[PDB]
Point group: C6
Chain length 48, copies 6
Amino acid sequence: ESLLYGYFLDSWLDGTASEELLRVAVNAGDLTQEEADKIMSYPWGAWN
Amino acid sequence: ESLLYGYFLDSWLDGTASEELLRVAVNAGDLTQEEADKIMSYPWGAWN
Amino acid sequence: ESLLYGYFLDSWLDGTASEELLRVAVNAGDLTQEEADKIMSYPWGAWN
Amino acid sequence: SESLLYGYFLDSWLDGTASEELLRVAVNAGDLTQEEADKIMSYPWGAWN
Amino acid sequence: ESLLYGYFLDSWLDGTASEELLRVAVNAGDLTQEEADKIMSYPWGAWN
Amino acid sequence: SESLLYGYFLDSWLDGTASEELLRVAVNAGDLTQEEADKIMSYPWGAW
């Protein structure tokens, strides 16, 4: 599991990360594509 | 124990997570069903 | 220490956790009884 | 090996929310060693308040 | 991976870290040049 | 390996809270090595 998985998931659940931002993280190798797809399976902005 | 166990327990105690959200995390494989059931034995929104 | 020992000690020190909450954590296996007893030895709400 | 809560208690000492009273309880509980509490007390109490 | 990679990436996303800061961290051995380049690929200040 | 509190003290230097006097105390306490204090003081005090 990527070290920043939880960090990016939390940003998705709080609505601060967009799909574009997750693509940047995948491109950088900070998330795998599979992890970004998992994160996007959650409701965007669920915490709000 | 799942890495995000404490993250999701804290979100249940702070009243931001719902049962529906914990089920999304179990589907994602970020929590096991047993862990979601442990979290739901605590008082939701206990932190206020 | 259990993974969440510091998390629950901090909640006791900040006055957010109650004895009941610690015992729910013991019942869930997130603290040992000995850990809950050690946490309750500290001043509740010391952080103010 | 460092007690896991060493940084936690040092931060409380620097923020002025802990005094020796709390460090005494932590040492008695086995959450800090006496040597660790003496190291923390070497810092300026409340410097980061 | 450098231990402070996430710390510096978060500071960049927050808009608190500057390129100069990342370069200081590289010179200090706290980041690799490749890591500073990865961080700079993200949008500066996307977190508020 | 970095001292456990390296990031903690570097962050306090960047946020303008720590002084050289504080770093001297941390080296004397064995919380930072002298090399680490020298690295930290290389960064811009109060940058954040």
